[PDB]
Amino acid sequence: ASTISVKDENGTVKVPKDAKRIVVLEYSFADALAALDVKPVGIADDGKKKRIIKPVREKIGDYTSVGTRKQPNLEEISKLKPDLIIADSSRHKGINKELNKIAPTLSLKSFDGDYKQNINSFKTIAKALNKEKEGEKRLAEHDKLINKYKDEIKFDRNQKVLPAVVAKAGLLAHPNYSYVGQFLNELGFKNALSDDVTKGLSKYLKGPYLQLDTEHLADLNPERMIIMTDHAKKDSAEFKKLQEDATWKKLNAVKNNRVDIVDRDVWARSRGLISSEEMAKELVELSKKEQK
Ligand SMILES: [Cl-]
Q1: CA 31 → CA 24, 74, 122, 292, distances in Å?
Q2: Quick one: how many helices (H) and strands (E) in the chain?
């Protein structure tokens, strides 16, 4: 057994050179494999086929679900007898010992990784699978496409942007160092949540995100909002109570038609090359709609 030594979040991992059958425990890792022409044999898809973004889903074809990302089914992982497991360095610390009994396991950033960190995980996966050259070519293609979309997004970058999900009668905002915040910065946007602003709102942190009630949204008053929801729906009970609020109606982004509701699976959960390409493409389309 020859191996390839790579670094992951726990140190060195010796990956067998014959690794072909791979179980992945986050969506970004499934994108990484598909980009490299590898079909994972198992995926923690939360029991929802639609959670794997369409172009990735269709490329991979049939696979076996190993259950939720929160609590993967180790019986199902062990039954697959994989060559390699790719686990999330934040989600899967608890099961790491058990996973290592089953197969060589890489522990890589996804859930707690920003845009660049997710890219890096992709690079580690490419190296682990003796596909470094293929990964370089794919990433050069990706970067060229992202920059092409950047140039095609017509929005005025001086309109500061707030990316957020809906939570508890307000917005749970993704700050400038989040995956979404950093990606928007890559596209030349200015996050409304500057470092100073976020410092001044930190008593409202809930882990990685900032809870903003309508009072604090009104104070921030970002020129643009991107609200990520399941199925890109805007008629949930929570969001409707928010949209009915008097302070909401006075917001600069609301009055001026600069609030866009986008798909949470694509924008927040996927964290892949294909999904970030689709996020950028969507911004181009939105920016080209009848100005009105
Ligand atoms: Cl997620």
Answers
A1: 10, 22, 9, 37
A2: 14, 13
Cα of 111 to ligand 1 centre, how many Å?
6
Contacts of 43 (CB under 8 A, 6+ apart): 23, 24, 25, 30, 52, 60, 63, 64, 65, 66
What CATH superfamily classification does 109-292 receive?
A: Nitrogenase molybdenum iron protein domain (3.40.50.1980)
Q: Which two tokens stand for residue 40?
A: 């994972």
Q: What is the CA(271)–ligand 1 centre distance, in A?
A: 8
- Tell me how the structure was determined: X-ray
- Domain 1-108 belongs to what architecture? 3-Layer(aba) Sandwich (3.40)
- SS3 of residue 160 by DSSP: coil
Structure tokens given for 203: 């008593």
110 CA → ligand 1 middle, Å: 8
Which residue ranges make up each domain of the chain?
1-108, 109-292
Neighbours of ion ligand 1 (CB under 5 A): 269
Resolution to one decimal, Å: 1.6
Task: State both tokens at 231.
Answer: 């199925």
Using the mean position of ligand 1's atoms as its centre, give its distance from the Cα of residue 173 in Å. 15
